[PDB]
Amino acid sequence: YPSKETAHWKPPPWNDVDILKEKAVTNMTLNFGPQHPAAHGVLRLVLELSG
Amino acid sequence: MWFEILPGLAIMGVCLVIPGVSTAYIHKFTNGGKEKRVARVQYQWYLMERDRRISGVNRYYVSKGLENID
Amino acid sequence: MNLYTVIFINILLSLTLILVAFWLPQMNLYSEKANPYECGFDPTSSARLPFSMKFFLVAITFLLFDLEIALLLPLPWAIQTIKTSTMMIMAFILVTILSLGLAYEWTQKGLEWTE
Amino acid sequence: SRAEYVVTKLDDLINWARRSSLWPMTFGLACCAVEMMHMAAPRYDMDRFGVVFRASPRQADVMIVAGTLTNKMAPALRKVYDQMPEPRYVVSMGSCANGGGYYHYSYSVVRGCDRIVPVDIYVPGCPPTAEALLYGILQLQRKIKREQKLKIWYRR
Amino acid sequence: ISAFLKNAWAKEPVLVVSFSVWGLAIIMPMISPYTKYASMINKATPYNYPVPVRDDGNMPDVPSHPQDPLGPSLDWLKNL
Amino acid sequence: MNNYIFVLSSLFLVGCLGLALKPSPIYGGLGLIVSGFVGCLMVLGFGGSFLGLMVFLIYLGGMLVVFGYTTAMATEEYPETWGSNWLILGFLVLGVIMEVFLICVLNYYDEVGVINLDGLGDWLMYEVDDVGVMLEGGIGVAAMYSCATWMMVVAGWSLFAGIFIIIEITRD
Amino acid sequence: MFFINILTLLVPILIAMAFLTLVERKILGYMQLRKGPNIVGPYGILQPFADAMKLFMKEPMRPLTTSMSLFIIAPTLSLTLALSLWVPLPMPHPLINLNLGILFILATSSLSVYSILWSGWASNSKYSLFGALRAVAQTISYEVTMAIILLSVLLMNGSYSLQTLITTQEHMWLLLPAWPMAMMWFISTLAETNRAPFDLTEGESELVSGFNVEYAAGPFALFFMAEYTNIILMNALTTIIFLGPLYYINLPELYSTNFMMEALLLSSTFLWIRASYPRFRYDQLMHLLWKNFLPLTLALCMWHISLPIFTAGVPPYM
Amino acid sequence: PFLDIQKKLGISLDRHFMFLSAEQPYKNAARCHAFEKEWIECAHGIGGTRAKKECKIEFDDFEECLLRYKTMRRMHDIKKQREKLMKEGKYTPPPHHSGREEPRP
Amino acid sequence: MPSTFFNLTMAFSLSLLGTLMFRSHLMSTLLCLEGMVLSLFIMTSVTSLNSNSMSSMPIPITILVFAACEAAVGLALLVKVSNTYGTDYVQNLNLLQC
Ligand SMILES: CS(=O)(=O)C1CCN(c2cccc(Cn3cc(-c4nc(-c5ccc(OC(F)(F)F)cc5)no4)ccc3=O)c2)CC1
Numbered sequence A: 001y002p003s004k005e006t007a008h009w010k011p012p013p014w015n016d017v018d019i020l021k022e023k024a025v026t027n028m029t030l031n032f033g034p035q036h037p038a039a040h041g042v043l044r045l046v047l048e049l050s051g
Numbered sequence B: 001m002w003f004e005i006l007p008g009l010a011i012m013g014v015c016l017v018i019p020g021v022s023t024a025y026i027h028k029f030t031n032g033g034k035e036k037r038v039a040r041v042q043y044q045w046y047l048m049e050r051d052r053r054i055s056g057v058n059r060y061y062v063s064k065g066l067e068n069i070d
Numbered sequence C: 001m002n003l004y005t006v007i008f009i010n011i012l013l014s015l016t017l018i019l020v021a022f023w024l025p026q027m028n029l030y031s032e033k034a035n036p037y038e039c040g041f042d043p044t045s046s047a048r049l050p051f052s053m054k055f056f057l058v059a060i061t062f063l064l065f066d067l068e069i070a071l072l073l074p075l076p077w078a079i080q081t082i083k084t085s086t087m088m089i090m091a092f093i094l095v096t097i098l099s100l101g102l103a104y105e106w107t108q109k110g111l112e113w114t115e
Numbered sequence D: 001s002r003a004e005y006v007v008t009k010l011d012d013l014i015n016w017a018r019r020s021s022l023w024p025m026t027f028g029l030a031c032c033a034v035e036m037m038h039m040a041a042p043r044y045d046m047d048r049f050g051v052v053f054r055a056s057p058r059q060a061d062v063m064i065v066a067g068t069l070t071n072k073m074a075p076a077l078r079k080v081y082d083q084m085p086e087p088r089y090v091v092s093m094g095s096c097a098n099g100g101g102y103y104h105y106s107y108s109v110v111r112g113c114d115r116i117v118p119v120d121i122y123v124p125g126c127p128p129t130a131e132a133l134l135y136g137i138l139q140l141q142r143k144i145k146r147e148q149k150l151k152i153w154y155r156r
Numbered sequence E: 001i002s003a004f005l006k007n008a009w010a011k012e013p014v015l016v017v018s019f020s021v022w023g024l025a026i027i028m029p030m031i032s033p034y035t036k037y038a039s040m041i042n043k044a045t046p047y048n049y050p051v052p053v054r055d056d057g058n059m060p061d062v063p064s065h066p067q068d069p070l071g072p073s074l075d076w077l078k079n080l
Numbered sequence F: 001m002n003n004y005i006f007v008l009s010s011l012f013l014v015g016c017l018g019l020a021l022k023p024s025p026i027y028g029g030l031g032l033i034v035s036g037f038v039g040c041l042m043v044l045g046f047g048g049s050f051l052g053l054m055v056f057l058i059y060l061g062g063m064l065v066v067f068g069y070t071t072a073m074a075t076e077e078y079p080e081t082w083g084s085n086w087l088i089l090g091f092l093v094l095g096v097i098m099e100v101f102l103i104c105v106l107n108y109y110d111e112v113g114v115i116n117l118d119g120l121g122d123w124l125m126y127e128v129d130d131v132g133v134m135l136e137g138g139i140g141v142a143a144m145y146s147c148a149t150w151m152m153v154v155a156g157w158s159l160f161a162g163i164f165i166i167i168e169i170t171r172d
Numbered sequence G: 001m002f003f004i005n006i007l008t009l010l011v012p013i014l015i016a017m018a019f020l021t022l023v024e025r026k027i028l029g030y031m032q033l034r035k036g037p038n039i040v041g042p043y044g045i046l047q048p049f050a051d052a053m054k055l056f057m058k059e060p061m062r063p064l065t066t067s068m069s070l071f072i073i074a075p076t077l078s079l080t081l082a083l084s085l086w087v088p089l090p091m092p093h094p095l096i097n098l099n100l101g102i103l104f105i106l107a108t109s110s111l112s113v114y115s116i117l118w119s120g121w122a123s124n125s126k127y128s129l130f131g132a133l134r135a136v137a138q139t140i141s142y143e144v145t146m147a148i149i150l151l152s153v154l155l156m157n158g159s160y161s162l163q164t165l166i167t168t169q170e171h172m173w174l175l176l177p178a179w180p181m182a183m184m185w186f187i188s189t190l191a192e193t194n195r196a197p198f199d200l201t202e203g204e205s206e207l208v209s210g211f212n213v214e215y216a217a218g219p220f221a222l223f224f225m226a227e228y229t230n231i232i233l234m235n236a237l238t239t240i241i242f243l244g245p246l247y248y249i250n251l252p253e254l255y256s257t258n259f260m261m262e263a264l265l266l267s268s269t270f271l272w273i274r275a276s277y278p279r280f281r282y283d284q285l286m287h288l289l290w291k292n293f294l295p296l297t298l299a300l301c302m303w304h305i306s307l308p309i310f311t312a313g314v315p316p317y318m
Numbered sequence H: 001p002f003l004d005i006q007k008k009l010g011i012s013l014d015r016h017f018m019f020l021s022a023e024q025p026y027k028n029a030a031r032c033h034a035f036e037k038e039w040i041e042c043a044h045g046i047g048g049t050r051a052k053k054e055c056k057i058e059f060d061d062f063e064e065c066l067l068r069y070k071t072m073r074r075m076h077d078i079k080k081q082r083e084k085l086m087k088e089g090k091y092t093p094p095p096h097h098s099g100r101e102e103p104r105p
Numbered sequence I: 001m002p003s004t005f006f007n008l009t010m011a012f013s014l015s016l017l018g019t020l021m022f023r024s025h026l027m028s029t030l031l032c033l034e035g036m037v038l039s040l041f042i043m044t045s046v047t048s049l050n051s052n053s054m055s056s057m058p059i060p061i062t063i064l065v066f067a068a069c070e071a072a073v074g075l076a077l078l079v080k081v082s083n084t085y086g087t088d089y090v091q092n093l094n095l096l097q098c
């Protein structure tokens, strides 16, 4: 039975699998230099990390 | 040479010896020339409270021998 | 009472050190000094974002192993018991089941980190 | 028991501490960093003087500009210096850092680190002999021997 | 199988030792003649008072005094 | 003295309240560590030490894992504290004031079987065996190996099954 | 009198931490073909005081991104616990006789990690967070084997008290029956302190300083001295448990002397090891402790559960 | 109880340590042991409906041993009256109540 | 004793209140659950020590065991939730309305 609350309701999927908004990756960016001892002095080395 | 290191080692050794000797001598000085009584179980604590009471002054290390039974 | 005394003495020593470290020296505060450190350049983001964990399963397992340790710790007393065969058998069963769980995790590659 | 005498002795003590314990920063840009190393080496043992390379500016007391300073690197150098806590000293090592040196007339070189940060001591050479850099460290030690801060506070 | 045990003893000796010690811990109690004495000792300790019994007059096997030669002796523990 | 155990219980209450106010799980784990420390203190003040040290170690490990997790799943750009939100700070202070009110009004209208400010410290250790040798708490917890063998197999199987279950849940 | 005993136990420990920094520098120097401090004082016995005074004379940092409360609490707690772990130690007589002294040690140590955690989180810098997570991993790695090693040893002592080990070793060290457990305990104490090869919490080659990177003179000094105090503490633990000083009730001074000798040996060994080896990768530490030490640790726990039974050598309860 | 498997096989997995009057380690005794024993022995063979009326005296003695509301009330009233007296100066605690006692033995 | 037990009961009730009154984060609710566990463990240990019933101390340790197992599976579910939505928020698992 429809109501003003159940108008936006959509019938669920046939396999219980829901097309879901693809949440993009959030990769921690880090300036590994310069002034870092490993970096031999003038290297910045911007890199992305998952952990 | 390598024997230039013995000063620091000797200093730290003295400093690490001080605590134990100090604790022992202080326990003796405060508990009547005896080792601080250990109360690991309630029986020892009962003994110590008995001693505290029977001793004229409330202190467990004043040992009362056969001089106090007649 | 003496334990309280010693621990509070240590609290006070540390706090005195920190007080005389924060109020004795001359200061000159400005934003470029008080700003975070990221190897000479400016951070591209905040450090308060999800830092993914690749050993989460091993940590979960560590919880249960800590509990098994909690159950193993009463042995010094359990060995003073008349029923010695029961204590022996139960301890052996406990340690063996622990090892079997660890082995299953190992084989199924739980101790290895997500990449 | 004059307060001025007491203050002079206290300042001697302050400077002795800040001097016999100079922790520089692992900040080497170019060739001159090699002579920095060699001054960390057995022949010239830095720690013998109380010198210790700490990698964080928030723990360092001095920074040796050991090589050429490009325009792409000057912001980071000024930032690191800014992040070092007072008292903070600076030492220019080589000819690249003092006045650009062999690359003075280049489009990508600052003709002196003294434009971006204030410099206490200049060590000339290309590269400066590690012995010379040590001479400069001790020159800095003496300069610190002559700070006379608390005497100034008492005279104010 | 000997070759497998051998290449494991060469490659992963830590697990070999672990299983061996596991088995020895599980076995040796079944082997020793001093296993029976653990419970006997843990029973010999008087953590409580030996509450005496009323002399009904029908306890011949029971002693009237500690130094009366009756009851459990601890010689097996005095010379063990 | 005499106010000792009551102060411990009140600190435990305040810790649990600041926890229930749900700030960033960092400060919540902090409050839980503090509450476990206070619980250890009070359990020691009632006679038993093994259980207190135990729960303390357990919750320390747990909050370690929880820190590791919240830094990865339960973090925010600006994590909330008790002071951050005026409403949360206000309800915290309000809860302290309400505890004070409840205590001071129960002492008056209520009987002494719940809160007796006069008579405090008289009922902690009702009875004791002055001549005793075998009263440590670990004796009971060791009974698991000899007498209460059922609890032991139960808990061990719970942990075994937990290993298998967490593996199955975390499978991708 | 008790406060005087507190002093005689506290101030020497701090002096020993300072001169331990000294001995560290000089030993590593002579291993590296160099001298080490000899300028500041006679053979360098004033370099630690110079460092400390200089630090407590520097401008500390109150950054803009930090949670100042934890940022300030963490070093307080670190130092407090580093000094509190020394109280229940028998040398041969402790200042605080605890029946569950081993568990006090365990809990206080497992607590000292939260100083690192909260420091690295408060600092609000990426390298600080990395150091904190590495500490999490390190603890998750070593804490499992620590307690089981210790239990397996204590199953011949009879209690968690640190003063029954003295009567247990009255005739013979606990190293002979437990040298495997002793080795594993040595490496795990090496890890508990974030000490090389396990200096991952402040790994300068990957993380400029780790949880210290935003910390400055005073609080940093607190962290550092806490580290160098826990070092001596764990050496003392090794040499009270597995190595046994001579206990003759009329001669506790000899006990303290030999205790000190062995502690110096073990600490110098820590420094030796820092000088001799590279640094692990913090996943390899987990793999080690969970694939070579934990299986063997369980096997030895079972072995030492059984040994008192098929030997009739169950220890006494007081 | 719902499935009395134990009472069938004749075992005891969880029922030998339910109440305080059960066998404790090293033959110690939980407090209120005798009160609990008497309550249980009275409530045996008659049911919980009768026991709520016929073992009421014993259950109440047990409840008082364990919770001790009445000893609390009594000592509180005594202390209250004594405080009133001292307030209005009609009482002085004897020596053995002020620390100064003959500490036997 | 009575004041201690009253305060521990009030603490359990506060932690239950927190568990019932959700906020955005789930781990906070898990922590409130752990706080309830703590309260109950402490109450049981205090009762067993006040009664001198050393046959009931094996109970609270089991309480802790099972509470920590619950926490473990909760953390695993939290992992899955974060993988799905990227966050541990509760307002995101509202698609089973149909
Ligand atoms: C290439 S290498 O292999 O050579 C490499 C090996 C490692 N290395 C090294 C080893 C130990 C110390 C240091 C100097 N150092 C000292 C401190 C620091 N020390 C104190 C302190 C507080 C109170 C003290 O006692 C009292 F003052 F009395 F209270 C004493 C000291 N606070 O912060 C902090 C950071 C730091 O680097 C350096 C040299 C170089």
Ligand code: SF4
Binding pocket: D030, D031, D032, D066, D067, D068, D093, D094, D095, D096, D097, D101, D102, D125, D126, D127, D128
């Ligand atoms: S001054 Fe010479 S040696 Fe130094 S960095 Fe420049 S070119 Fe290299």
